Amino acid sequence: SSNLTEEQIAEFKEAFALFDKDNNGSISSSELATVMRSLGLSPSEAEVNDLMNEIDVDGNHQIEFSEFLALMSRQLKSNDSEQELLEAFKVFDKNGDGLISAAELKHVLTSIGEKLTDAELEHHHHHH
Ligand SMILES: [Ca+2]
Ligand SMILES: [Ca+2]
Ligand SMILES: [Ca+2]
């Protein structure tokens, strides 16, 4: 399947929980950051909002169950949406597929480890 189905969503409902503390469905740079700080790095709130800005379609400072998954839908034949964002979330795609799924976002949640970088595909390091 090359599209998100009730299955994938049903699978994402989990991967999300991992990032969802109150399990409300909406994640805030605060909570999201709380996940990173646990990973290894410690992104600043203002530094997170930067990442939450992209995921944010309106800038409410919240990631909807649709948006979050959108980060994976971003991919598409024609480039009618920021695809450079998929480069940052590529860390999850160690198989270098260019696309990440729920089982991948949930598998990464654990697969995480110091041995991780955003230079996976990103030709040039955003932060030279
Ligand atoms: Ca949450
Ligand atoms: Ca939003
Ligand atoms: Ca993949």
Side-chain angles (χ1 to χ4, degrees):
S1 292
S2 286
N3 303 283
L4 306 152
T5 75
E6 58 158 334
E7 308 202 274
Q8 296 210 24
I9 297 162
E11 288 282 277
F12 275 118
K13 270 180 196 316
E14 326 201 56
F16 210 96
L18 291 328
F19 282 94
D20 215 305
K21 310 253 177 36
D22 61 56
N23 194 327
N24 59 327
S26 337
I27 311 154
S28 54
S29 102
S30 178
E31 306 176 274
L32 213 318
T34 307
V35 203
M36 309 313 312
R37 63 173 296 176
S38 199
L39 294 210
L41 69 153
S42 324
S44 323
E45 163 152 32
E47 272 296 293
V48 193
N49 265 298
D50 174 37
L51 303 211
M52 305 287 307
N53 225 323
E54 302 275 30
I55 304 150
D56 271 317
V57 165
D58 53 66
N60 65 350
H61 196 156
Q62 304 182 120
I63 305 320
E64 223 182 25
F65 186 34
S66 184
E67 291 176 285
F68 189 97
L69 273 75
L71 307 187
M72 294 148 245
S73 86
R74 308 209 150 200
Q75 281 40 247
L76 203 279
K77 208 271 278 89
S78 193
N79 276 218
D80 209 81
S81 82
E82 163 169 352
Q83 300 312 134
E84 321 203 273
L85 198 275
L86 150 291
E87 312 274 302
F89 269 81
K90 184 91 149 32
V91 314
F92 293 2
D93 210 336
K94 278 268 80 153
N95 47 97
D97 267 344
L99 198 87
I100 34 157
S101 282
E104 208 153 90
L105 211 154
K106 196 206 187 208
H107 273 321
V108 89
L109 270 151
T110 220
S111 210
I112 279 152
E114 310 211 340
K115 301 195 68 163
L116 269 159
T117 40
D118 282 352
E120 164 40 64
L121 87 152
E122 284 184 24
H123 293 150
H124 78 236
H125 205 272
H126 167 22
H127 191 279
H128 197 220

PDB file of all heavy atoms in Angstrom, residues 79-115:
ATOM      1  N   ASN A  79       6.138  18.076  -6.540  1.00  0.00           N
ATOM      2  CA  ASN A  79       6.567  18.777  -5.341  1.00  0.00           C
ATOM      3  C   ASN A  79       5.658  19.986  -5.109  1.00  0.00           C
ATOM      4  O   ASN A  79       5.981  21.097  -5.526  1.00  0.00           O
ATOM      5  CB  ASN A  79       8.002  19.284  -5.484  1.00  0.00           C
ATOM      6  CG  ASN A  79       9.010  18.186  -5.137  1.00  0.00           C
ATOM      7  OD1 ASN A  79      10.045  18.424  -4.537  1.00  0.00           O
ATOM      8  ND2 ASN A  79       8.650  16.973  -5.548  1.00  0.00           N
ATOM      9  N   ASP A  80       4.541  19.728  -4.445  1.00  0.00           N
ATOM     10  CA  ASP A  80       3.584  20.782  -4.154  1.00  0.00           C
ATOM     11  C   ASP A  80       3.559  21.039  -2.646  1.00  0.00           C
ATOM     12  O   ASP A  80       2.617  21.637  -2.130  1.00  0.00           O
ATOM     13  CB  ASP A  80       2.174  20.380  -4.589  1.00  0.00           C
ATOM     14  CG  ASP A  80       1.261  21.545  -4.981  1.00  0.00           C
ATOM     15  OD1 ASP A  80       1.434  21.992  -6.179  1.00  0.00           O
ATOM     16  OD2 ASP A  80       0.429  22.002  -4.183  1.00  0.00           O
ATOM     17  N   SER A  81       4.606  20.574  -1.981  1.00  0.00           N
ATOM     18  CA  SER A  81       4.716  20.745  -0.543  1.00  0.00           C
ATOM     19  C   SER A  81       6.159  20.502  -0.095  1.00  0.00           C
ATOM     20  O   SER A  81       6.873  19.700  -0.695  1.00  0.00           O
ATOM     21  CB  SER A  81       3.765  19.803   0.199  1.00  0.00           C
ATOM     22  OG  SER A  81       4.306  18.491   0.328  1.00  0.00           O
ATOM     23  N   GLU A  82       6.546  21.210   0.955  1.00  0.00           N
ATOM     24  CA  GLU A  82       7.891  21.082   1.491  1.00  0.00           C
ATOM     25  C   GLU A  82       8.264  19.605   1.641  1.00  0.00           C
ATOM     26  O   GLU A  82       7.639  18.878   2.411  1.00  0.00           O
ATOM     27  CB  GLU A  82       8.023  21.819   2.825  1.00  0.00           C
ATOM     28  CG  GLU A  82       9.263  21.351   3.589  1.00  0.00           C
ATOM     29  CD  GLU A  82       9.549  22.266   4.783  1.00  0.00           C
ATOM     30  OE1 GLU A  82       8.828  23.333   4.836  1.00  0.00           O
ATOM     31  OE2 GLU A  82      10.422  21.955   5.606  1.00  0.00           O
ATOM     32  N   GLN A  83       9.282  19.207   0.892  1.00  0.00           N
ATOM     33  CA  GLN A  83       9.746  17.830   0.932  1.00  0.00           C
ATOM     34  C   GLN A  83      11.044  17.731   1.735  1.00  0.00           C
ATOM     35  O   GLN A  83      11.495  16.634   2.059  1.00  0.00           O
ATOM     36  CB  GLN A  83       9.931  17.273  -0.481  1.00  0.00           C
ATOM     37  CG  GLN A  83       8.615  17.310  -1.261  1.00  0.00           C
ATOM     38  CD  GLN A  83       7.469  16.727  -0.432  1.00  0.00           C
ATOM     39  OE1 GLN A  83       6.383  17.277  -0.353  1.00  0.00           O
ATOM     40  NE2 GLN A  83       7.770  15.584   0.179  1.00  0.00           N
ATOM     41  N   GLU A  84      11.609  18.892   2.032  1.00  0.00           N
ATOM     42  CA  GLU A  84      12.848  18.950   2.790  1.00  0.00           C
ATOM     43  C   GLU A  84      12.599  18.542   4.244  1.00  0.00           C
ATOM     44  O   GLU A  84      13.540  18.248   4.979  1.00  0.00           O
ATOM     45  CB  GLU A  84      13.475  20.342   2.711  1.00  0.00           C
ATOM     46  CG  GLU A  84      13.326  20.933   1.308  1.00  0.00           C
ATOM     47  CD  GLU A  84      14.384  22.007   1.049  1.00  0.00           C
ATOM     48  OE1 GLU A  84      14.169  23.182   1.381  1.00  0.00           O
ATOM     49  OE2 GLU A  84      15.463  21.584   0.483  1.00  0.00           O
ATOM     50  N   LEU A  85      11.326  18.537   4.615  1.00  0.00           N
ATOM     51  CA  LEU A  85      10.943  18.170   5.967  1.00  0.00           C
ATOM     52  C   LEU A  85      11.061  16.654   6.132  1.00  0.00           C
ATOM     53  O   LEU A  85      11.327  16.164   7.228  1.00  0.00           O
ATOM     54  CB  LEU A  85       9.553  18.718   6.297  1.00  0.00           C
ATOM     55  CG  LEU A  85       9.198  18.797   7.783  1.00  0.00           C
ATOM     56  CD1 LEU A  85       8.651  17.459   8.287  1.00  0.00           C
ATOM     57  CD2 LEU A  85      10.394  19.275   8.607  1.00  0.00           C
ATOM     58  N   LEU A  86      10.858  15.953   5.026  1.00  0.00           N
ATOM     59  CA  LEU A  86      10.939  14.501   5.035  1.00  0.00           C
ATOM     60  C   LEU A  86      12.399  14.077   5.212  1.00  0.00           C
ATOM     61  O   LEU A  86      12.678  12.924   5.536  1.00  0.00           O
ATOM     62  CB  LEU A  86      10.277  13.921   3.784  1.00  0.00           C
ATOM     63  CG  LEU A  86      10.851  12.596   3.275  1.00  0.00           C
ATOM     64  CD1 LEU A  86      12.262  12.788   2.717  1.00  0.00           C
ATOM     65  CD2 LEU A  86      10.806  11.525   4.367  1.00  0.00           C
ATOM     66  N   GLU A  87      13.289  15.032   4.991  1.00  0.00           N
ATOM     67  CA  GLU A  87      14.714  14.772   5.123  1.00  0.00           C
ATOM     68  C   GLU A  87      15.109  14.718   6.599  1.00  0.00           C
ATOM     69  O   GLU A  87      15.994  13.953   6.981  1.00  0.00           O
ATOM     70  CB  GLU A  87      15.534  15.824   4.373  1.00  0.00           C
ATOM     71  CG  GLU A  87      14.986  16.043   2.961  1.00  0.00           C
ATOM     72  CD  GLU A  87      15.586  15.037   1.977  1.00  0.00           C
ATOM     73  OE1 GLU A  87      16.873  15.060   1.892  1.00  0.00           O
ATOM     74  OE2 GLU A  87      14.844  14.281   1.334  1.00  0.00           O
ATOM     75  N   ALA A  88      14.436  15.541   7.390  1.00  0.00           N
ATOM     76  CA  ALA A  88      14.707  15.596   8.817  1.00  0.00           C
ATOM     77  C   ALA A  88      14.123  14.352   9.490  1.00  0.00           C
ATOM     78  O   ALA A  88      14.746  13.773  10.379  1.00  0.00           O
ATOM     79  CB  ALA A  88      14.138  16.894   9.395  1.00  0.00           C
ATOM     80  N   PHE A  89      12.933  13.979   9.042  1.00  0.00           N
ATOM     81  CA  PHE A  89      12.259  12.814   9.591  1.00  0.00           C
ATOM     82  C   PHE A  89      12.740  11.531   8.911  1.00  0.00           C
ATOM     83  O   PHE A  89      12.144  10.469   9.088  1.00  0.00           O
ATOM     84  CB  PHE A  89      10.764  12.993   9.317  1.00  0.00           C
ATOM     85  CG  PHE A  89      10.009  13.713  10.437  1.00  0.00           C
ATOM     86  CD1 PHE A  89      10.050  15.070  10.522  1.00  0.00           C
ATOM     87  CD2 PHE A  89       9.296  12.996  11.346  1.00  0.00           C
ATOM     88  CE1 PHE A  89       9.349  15.738  11.560  1.00  0.00           C
ATOM     89  CE2 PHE A  89       8.594  13.665  12.384  1.00  0.00           C
ATOM     90  CZ  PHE A  89       8.636  15.022  12.469  1.00  0.00           C
ATOM     91  N   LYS A  90      13.814  11.670   8.148  1.00  0.00           N
ATOM     92  CA  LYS A  90      14.382  10.534   7.441  1.00  0.00           C
ATOM     93  C   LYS A  90      15.139   9.649   8.432  1.00  0.00           C
ATOM     94  O   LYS A  90      15.345   8.464   8.178  1.00  0.00           O
ATOM     95  CB  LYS A  90      15.236  11.010   6.263  1.00  0.00           C
ATOM     96  CG  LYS A  90      15.760   9.822   5.453  1.00  0.00           C
ATOM     97  CD  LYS A  90      14.799   9.467   4.315  1.00  0.00           C
ATOM     98  CE  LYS A  90      15.557   8.895   3.116  1.00  0.00           C
ATOM     99  NZ  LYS A  90      16.753   8.148   3.567  1.00  0.00           N
ATOM    100  N   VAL A  91      15.533  10.259   9.540  1.00  0.00           N
ATOM    101  CA  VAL A  91      16.263   9.541  10.571  1.00  0.00           C
ATOM    102  C   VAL A  91      15.540   8.228  10.880  1.00  0.00           C
ATOM    103  O   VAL A  91      16.178   7.222  11.189  1.00  0.00           O
ATOM    104  CB  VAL A  91      16.441  10.430  11.802  1.00  0.00           C
ATOM    105  CG1 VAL A  91      16.896  11.835  11.403  1.00  0.00           C
ATOM    106  CG2 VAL A  91      15.155  10.484  12.630  1.00  0.00           C
ATOM    107  N   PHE A  92      14.219   8.281  10.787  1.00  0.00           N
ATOM    108  CA  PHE A  92      13.403   7.109  11.055  1.00  0.00           C
ATOM    109  C   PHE A  92      13.542   6.077   9.933  1.00  0.00           C
ATOM    110  O   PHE A  92      13.441   4.878  10.105  1.00  0.00           O
ATOM    111  CB  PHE A  92      11.950   7.581  11.119  1.00  0.00           C
ATOM    112  CG  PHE A  92      11.644   8.491  12.311  1.00  0.00           C
ATOM    113  CD1 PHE A  92      12.638   8.844  13.169  1.00  0.00           C
ATOM    114  CD2 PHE A  92      10.378   8.947  12.512  1.00  0.00           C
ATOM    115  CE1 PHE A  92      12.354   9.689  14.275  1.00  0.00           C
ATOM    116  CE2 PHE A  92      10.094   9.791  13.618  1.00  0.00           C
ATOM    117  CZ  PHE A  92      11.088  10.144  14.476  1.00  0.00           C
ATOM    118  N   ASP A  93      13.781   6.575   8.751  1.00  0.00           N
ATOM    119  CA  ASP A  93      13.943   5.673   7.577  1.00  0.00           C
ATOM    120  C   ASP A  93      15.418   5.294   7.407  1.00  0.00           C
ATOM    121  O   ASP A  93      16.079   5.911   6.574  1.00  0.00           O
ATOM    122  CB  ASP A  93      13.458   6.492   6.380  1.00  0.00           C
ATOM    123  CG  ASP A  93      12.869   5.554   5.324  1.00  0.00           C
ATOM    124  OD1 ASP A  93      13.238   4.390   5.321  1.00  0.00           O
ATOM    125  OD2 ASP A  93      12.062   6.014   4.534  1.00  0.00           O
ATOM    126  N   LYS A  94      15.893   4.324   8.175  1.00  0.00           N
ATOM    127  CA  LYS A  94      17.282   3.909   8.079  1.00  0.00           C
ATOM    128  C   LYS A  94      17.458   3.011   6.852  1.00  0.00           C
ATOM    129  O   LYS A  94      18.582   2.759   6.419  1.00  0.00           O
ATOM    130  CB  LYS A  94      17.738   3.257   9.387  1.00  0.00           C
ATOM    131  CG  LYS A  94      18.138   4.316  10.416  1.00  0.00           C
ATOM    132  CD  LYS A  94      19.634   4.623  10.335  1.00  0.00           C
ATOM    133  CE  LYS A  94      19.936   5.577   9.178  1.00  0.00           C
ATOM    134  NZ  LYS A  94      21.163   6.356   9.455  1.00  0.00           N
ATOM    135  N   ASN A  95      16.332   2.554   6.326  1.00  0.00           N
ATOM    136  CA  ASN A  95      16.348   1.691   5.158  1.00  0.00           C
ATOM    137  C   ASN A  95      16.438   2.551   3.895  1.00  0.00           C
ATOM    138  O   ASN A  95      16.403   2.029   2.781  1.00  0.00           O
ATOM    139  CB  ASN A  95      15.068   0.857   5.072  1.00  0.00           C
ATOM    140  CG  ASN A  95      13.830   1.726   5.303  1.00  0.00           C
ATOM    141  OD1 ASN A  95      13.180   2.184   4.378  1.00  0.00           O
ATOM    142  ND2 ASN A  95      13.543   1.927   6.585  1.00  0.00           N
ATOM    143  N   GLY A  96      16.552   3.852   4.111  1.00  0.00           N
ATOM    144  CA  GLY A  96      16.648   4.789   3.005  1.00  0.00           C
ATOM    145  C   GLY A  96      15.568   4.511   1.957  1.00  0.00           C
ATOM    146  O   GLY A  96      15.872   4.082   0.845  1.00  0.00           O
ATOM    147  N   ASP A  97      14.328   4.770   2.348  1.00  0.00           N
ATOM    148  CA  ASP A  97      13.202   4.554   1.457  1.00  0.00           C
ATOM    149  C   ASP A  97      12.625   5.906   1.032  1.00  0.00           C
ATOM    150  O   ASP A  97      11.936   6.000   0.018  1.00  0.00           O
ATOM    151  CB  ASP A  97      12.092   3.765   2.154  1.00  0.00           C
ATOM    152  CG  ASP A  97      12.155   2.248   1.958  1.00  0.00           C
ATOM    153  OD1 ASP A  97      12.922   1.854   0.998  1.00  0.00           O
ATOM    154  OD2 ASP A  97      11.506   1.483   2.686  1.00  0.00           O
ATOM    155  N   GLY A  98      12.930   6.920   1.829  1.00  0.00           N
ATOM    156  CA  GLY A  98      12.452   8.263   1.549  1.00  0.00           C
ATOM    157  C   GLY A  98      11.058   8.482   2.140  1.00  0.00           C
ATOM    158  O   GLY A  98      10.541   9.598   2.123  1.00  0.00           O
ATOM    159  N   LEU A  99      10.489   7.400   2.649  1.00  0.00           N
ATOM    160  CA  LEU A  99       9.165   7.460   3.246  1.00  0.00           C
ATOM    161  C   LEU A  99       9.155   6.642   4.539  1.00  0.00           C
ATOM    162  O   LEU A  99       9.708   5.545   4.588  1.00  0.00           O
ATOM    163  CB  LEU A  99       8.102   7.026   2.235  1.00  0.00           C
ATOM    164  CG  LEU A  99       6.662   7.430   2.559  1.00  0.00           C
ATOM    165  CD1 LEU A  99       6.350   8.828   2.020  1.00  0.00           C
ATOM    166  CD2 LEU A  99       5.670   6.384   2.048  1.00  0.00           C
ATOM    167  N   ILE A 100       8.519   7.208   5.554  1.00  0.00           N
ATOM    168  CA  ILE A 100       8.429   6.545   6.843  1.00  0.00           C
ATOM    169  C   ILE A 100       6.964   6.212   7.140  1.00  0.00           C
ATOM    170  O   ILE A 100       6.065   6.962   6.762  1.00  0.00           O
ATOM    171  CB  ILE A 100       9.099   7.389   7.929  1.00  0.00           C
ATOM    172  CG1 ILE A 100       8.921   8.883   7.649  1.00  0.00           C
ATOM    173  CG2 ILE A 100      10.572   7.007   8.089  1.00  0.00           C
ATOM    174  CD1 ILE A 100       9.054   9.701   8.934  1.00  0.00           C
ATOM    175  N   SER A 101       6.771   5.088   7.813  1.00  0.00           N
ATOM    176  CA  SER A 101       5.432   4.647   8.164  1.00  0.00           C
ATOM    177  C   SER A 101       5.257   4.664   9.684  1.00  0.00           C
ATOM    178  O   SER A 101       6.149   5.101  10.410  1.00  0.00           O
ATOM    179  CB  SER A 101       5.152   3.246   7.615  1.00  0.00           C
ATOM    180  OG  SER A 101       4.846   3.271   6.223  1.00  0.00           O
ATOM    181  N   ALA A 102       4.101   4.187  10.120  1.00  0.00           N
ATOM    182  CA  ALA A 102       3.798   4.143  11.542  1.00  0.00           C
ATOM    183  C   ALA A 102       4.669   3.079  12.212  1.00  0.00           C
ATOM    184  O   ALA A 102       5.272   3.333  13.254  1.00  0.00           O
ATOM    185  CB  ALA A 102       2.303   3.880  11.736  1.00  0.00           C
ATOM    186  N   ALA A 103       4.708   1.912  11.588  1.00  0.00           N
ATOM    187  CA  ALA A 103       5.495   0.808  12.111  1.00  0.00           C
ATOM    188  C   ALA A 103       6.969   1.220  12.165  1.00  0.00           C
ATOM    189  O   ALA A 103       7.753   0.636  12.910  1.00  0.00           O
ATOM    190  CB  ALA A 103       5.269  -0.435  11.250  1.00  0.00           C
ATOM    191  N   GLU A 104       7.299   2.223  11.364  1.00  0.00           N
ATOM    192  CA  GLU A 104       8.664   2.719  11.312  1.00  0.00           C
ATOM    193  C   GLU A 104       8.870   3.817  12.358  1.00  0.00           C
ATOM    194  O   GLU A 104       9.938   3.909  12.962  1.00  0.00           O
ATOM    195  CB  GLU A 104       9.009   3.226   9.910  1.00  0.00           C
ATOM    196  CG  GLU A 104      10.506   3.085   9.629  1.00  0.00           C
ATOM    197  CD  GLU A 104      10.771   2.940   8.129  1.00  0.00           C
ATOM    198  OE1 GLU A 104      10.953   4.050   7.498  1.00  0.00           O
ATOM    199  OE2 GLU A 104      10.796   1.814   7.610  1.00  0.00           O
ATOM    200  N   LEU A 105       7.833   4.619  12.540  1.00  0.00           N
ATOM    201  CA  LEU A 105       7.887   5.707  13.503  1.00  0.00           C
ATOM    202  C   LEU A 105       7.790   5.133  14.918  1.00  0.00           C
ATOM    203  O   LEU A 105       8.269   5.744  15.873  1.00  0.00           O
ATOM    204  CB  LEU A 105       6.817   6.754  13.189  1.00  0.00           C
ATOM    205  CG  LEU A 105       7.158   8.195  13.571  1.00  0.00           C
ATOM    206  CD1 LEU A 105       6.391   9.190  12.696  1.00  0.00           C
ATOM    207  CD2 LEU A 105       6.917   8.439  15.062  1.00  0.00           C
ATOM    208  N   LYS A 106       7.167   3.968  15.009  1.00  0.00           N
ATOM    209  CA  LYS A 106       7.002   3.306  16.291  1.00  0.00           C
ATOM    210  C   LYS A 106       8.229   2.437  16.576  1.00  0.00           C
ATOM    211  O   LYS A 106       8.604   2.244  17.730  1.00  0.00           O
ATOM    212  CB  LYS A 106       5.681   2.535  16.331  1.00  0.00           C
ATOM    213  CG  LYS A 106       5.304   2.164  17.767  1.00  0.00           C
ATOM    214  CD  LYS A 106       4.420   0.915  17.796  1.00  0.00           C
ATOM    215  CE  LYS A 106       3.910   0.638  19.212  1.00  0.00           C
ATOM    216  NZ  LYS A 106       3.653  -0.807  19.397  1.00  0.00           N
ATOM    217  N   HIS A 107       8.821   1.937  15.500  1.00  0.00           N
ATOM    218  CA  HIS A 107       9.998   1.093  15.619  1.00  0.00           C
ATOM    219  C   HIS A 107      11.217   1.957  15.950  1.00  0.00           C
ATOM    220  O   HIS A 107      12.111   1.522  16.673  1.00  0.00           O
ATOM    221  CB  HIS A 107      10.193   0.252  14.355  1.00  0.00           C
ATOM    222  CG  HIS A 107       9.444  -1.059  14.369  1.00  0.00           C
ATOM    223  ND1 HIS A 107       9.325  -1.842  15.504  1.00  0.00           N
ATOM    224  CD2 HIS A 107       8.778  -1.715  13.376  1.00  0.00           C
ATOM    225  CE1 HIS A 107       8.617  -2.919  15.196  1.00  0.00           C
ATOM    226  NE2 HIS A 107       8.281  -2.839  13.877  1.00  0.00           N
ATOM    227  N   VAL A 108      11.211   3.165  15.406  1.00  0.00           N
ATOM    228  CA  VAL A 108      12.306   4.093  15.633  1.00  0.00           C
ATOM    229  C   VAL A 108      12.259   4.584  17.082  1.00  0.00           C
ATOM    230  O   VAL A 108      13.293   4.689  17.740  1.00  0.00           O
ATOM    231  CB  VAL A 108      12.247   5.233  14.615  1.00  0.00           C
ATOM    232  CG1 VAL A 108      11.374   6.381  15.126  1.00  0.00           C
ATOM    233  CG2 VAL A 108      13.651   5.727  14.263  1.00  0.00           C
ATOM    234  N   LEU A 109      11.047   4.870  17.538  1.00  0.00           N
ATOM    235  CA  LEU A 109      10.852   5.347  18.896  1.00  0.00           C
ATOM    236  C   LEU A 109      11.763   4.562  19.843  1.00  0.00           C
ATOM    237  O   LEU A 109      12.190   5.084  20.872  1.00  0.00           O
ATOM    238  CB  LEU A 109       9.372   5.287  19.277  1.00  0.00           C
ATOM    239  CG  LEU A 109       8.547   6.538  18.963  1.00  0.00           C
ATOM    240  CD1 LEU A 109       7.082   6.179  18.707  1.00  0.00           C
ATOM    241  CD2 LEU A 109       8.696   7.585  20.069  1.00  0.00           C
ATOM    242  N   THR A 110      12.032   3.322  19.461  1.00  0.00           N
ATOM    243  CA  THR A 110      12.885   2.462  20.264  1.00  0.00           C
ATOM    244  C   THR A 110      14.252   2.295  19.599  1.00  0.00           C
ATOM    245  O   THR A 110      15.276   2.261  20.278  1.00  0.00           O
ATOM    246  CB  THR A 110      12.148   1.137  20.480  1.00  0.00           C
ATOM    247  OG1 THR A 110      12.439   0.796  21.832  1.00  0.00           O
ATOM    248  CG2 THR A 110      12.755  -0.009  19.668  1.00  0.00           C
ATOM    249  N   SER A 111      14.224   2.195  18.277  1.00  0.00           N
ATOM    250  CA  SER A 111      15.448   2.033  17.513  1.00  0.00           C
ATOM    251  C   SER A 111      16.387   3.214  17.771  1.00  0.00           C
ATOM    252  O   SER A 111      17.577   3.143  17.467  1.00  0.00           O
ATOM    253  CB  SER A 111      15.151   1.908  16.018  1.00  0.00           C
ATOM    254  OG  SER A 111      16.121   1.108  15.345  1.00  0.00           O
ATOM    255  N   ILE A 112      15.815   4.272  18.327  1.00  0.00           N
ATOM    256  CA  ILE A 112      16.586   5.466  18.630  1.00  0.00           C
ATOM    257  C   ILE A 112      17.917   5.062  19.264  1.00  0.00           C
ATOM    258  O   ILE A 112      18.077   3.928  19.713  1.00  0.00           O
ATOM    259  CB  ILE A 112      15.764   6.432  19.486  1.00  0.00           C
ATOM    260  CG1 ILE A 112      14.799   7.245  18.622  1.00  0.00           C
ATOM    261  CG2 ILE A 112      16.673   7.326  20.329  1.00  0.00           C
ATOM    262  CD1 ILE A 112      13.560   7.654  19.421  1.00  0.00           C
ATOM    263  N   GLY A 113      18.841   6.011  19.281  1.00  0.00           N
ATOM    264  CA  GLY A 113      20.154   5.769  19.854  1.00  0.00           C
ATOM    265  C   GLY A 113      21.161   6.820  19.383  1.00  0.00           C
ATOM    266  O   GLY A 113      20.970   7.445  18.340  1.00  0.00           O
ATOM    267  N   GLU A 114      22.212   6.983  20.173  1.00  0.00           N
ATOM    268  CA  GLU A 114      23.249   7.947  19.849  1.00  0.00           C
ATOM    269  C   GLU A 114      23.608   7.864  18.364  1.00  0.00           C
ATOM    270  O   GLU A 114      23.857   8.883  17.723  1.00  0.00           O
ATOM    271  CB  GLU A 114      24.486   7.737  20.725  1.00  0.00           C
ATOM    272  CG  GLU A 114      24.104   7.662  22.204  1.00  0.00           C
ATOM    273  CD  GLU A 114      25.231   8.198  23.089  1.00  0.00           C
ATOM    274  OE1 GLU A 114      26.387   8.272  22.645  1.00  0.00           O
ATOM    275  OE2 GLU A 114      24.872   8.549  24.277  1.00  0.00           O
ATOM    276  N   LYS A 115      23.623   6.638  17.860  1.00  0.00           N
ATOM    277  CA  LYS A 115      23.947   6.408  16.463  1.00  0.00           C
ATOM    278  C   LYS A 115      22.789   6.892  15.589  1.00  0.00           C
ATOM    279  O   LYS A 115      22.083   6.087  14.984  1.00  0.00           O
ATOM    280  CB  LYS A 115      24.319   4.941  16.234  1.00  0.00           C
ATOM    281  CG  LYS A 115      25.522   4.539  17.090  1.00  0.00           C
ATOM    282  CD  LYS A 115      26.124   3.219  16.605  1.00  0.00           C
ATOM    283  CE  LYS A 115      26.777   3.387  15.231  1.00  0.00           C
ATOM    284  NZ  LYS A 115      27.686   2.253  14.948  1.00  0.00           N
TER     285      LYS A 115
END
